[PDB]
Amino acid sequence: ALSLTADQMVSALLDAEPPILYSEYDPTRPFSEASMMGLLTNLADRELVHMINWAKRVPGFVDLTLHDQVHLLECAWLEILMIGLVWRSMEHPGKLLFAPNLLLDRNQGKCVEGMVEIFDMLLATSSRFRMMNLQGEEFVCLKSIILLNSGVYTFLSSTLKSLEEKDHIHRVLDKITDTLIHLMAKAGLTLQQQHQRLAQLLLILSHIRHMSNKGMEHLYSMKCKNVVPLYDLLLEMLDAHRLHA
């Protein structure tokens, strides 16, 4: 990613996109009977496996140590799910497209205590993306920045190796920055609009962090899933052999 062109980064990021999954419930059966958090939790957990696959395809990520890859994903996984959700909801004003067969409005969020607060922030972010006319090429840049940025300030250590890792990450972030500006210039924005648009995009990332933090707080009162530490579960998924090569 530090020798990749802007064009090569964009195509690698587009190539790495995960699939859109469906909610798993019998569509021949009634709805009051479904647990909305059960449905949402089951969806999010299935997405997580595809998120690791994606992460490994972001330029520069697998050059990191396994521990650092784990750390970054443990820090960013809910931000990554949420930016994905806001992106697929953009063309669905007033609703959240959790899955193609699970499109929910704010009143359906009231179904779970404390959830409408989260729904309302996601919906607002979706509206901001639509208003900005966010582009698919810009979106994949933003999602990769979330992956690389959100945990880079909290690694414990400052070993030599740790210092090298942080350097590499900042270097990859720099290339994604170069890519976003390249995208915008190719689109014919002026120099001034480029830097303004870059700032507008990066400041939305502060809101997505906010939503992740509040959603983690909200999740930690429900059942959703807290068995086996997330780090261990991530480590397992990430620590693959090369036997099915």
Next chain:
Amino acid sequence: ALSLTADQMVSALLDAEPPILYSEYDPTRPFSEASMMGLLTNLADRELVHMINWAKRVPGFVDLTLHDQVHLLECAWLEILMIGLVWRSMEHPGKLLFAPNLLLDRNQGKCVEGMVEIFDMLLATSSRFRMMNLQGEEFVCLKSIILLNSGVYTFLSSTLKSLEEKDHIHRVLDKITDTLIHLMAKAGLTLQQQHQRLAQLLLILSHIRHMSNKGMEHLYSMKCKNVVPLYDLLLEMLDAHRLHA
């Protein structure tokens, strides 16, 4: 701020800076006997009055409705205190300069259950600012962006007035973006370093949001202060008469 030059914005922001306050404790008396959270809370509350004064001097802020000014400050006050703290700690490696007479290391943070976690993030942010060689002119831009950005996605409404307000804020943020790039160009960074440095600065704001969220979670288990709603207290401070004109 939408007709202010880059130079005029920078000088208005420098002119608006709040003073550095001292911790209030008898320096002739021992320390084990002081409540660290009492000291910290008393300091932070005294800063808040100066924060409103400052906010009113940020270009474009008082053109907002009183309700919107309240909202922005209710959303950003801890981010604003924290970026201030990390800025005055930059030249004090391993320590947090809460006040000139209150410089604390991570081990002094262990004094309060769950506080060392927060200290360690603040310290890391301070280290990142030092490594970036953040400049006083850049800092005041970042603090004003925090003020205008952190609550602009969560206003309830979407009245006409509400829509106009959001427009004005995005317009002011755009000018601060223009100011940061101006600063960097005047410093002789290349076009490419400008946009890279702008992105590095704006991504730190995602970490400061993170620290605010975690600190709000941590504060909500202690005594610190929760009497009278923050909105009302802010409204009072902000809703000034013009009699002492």
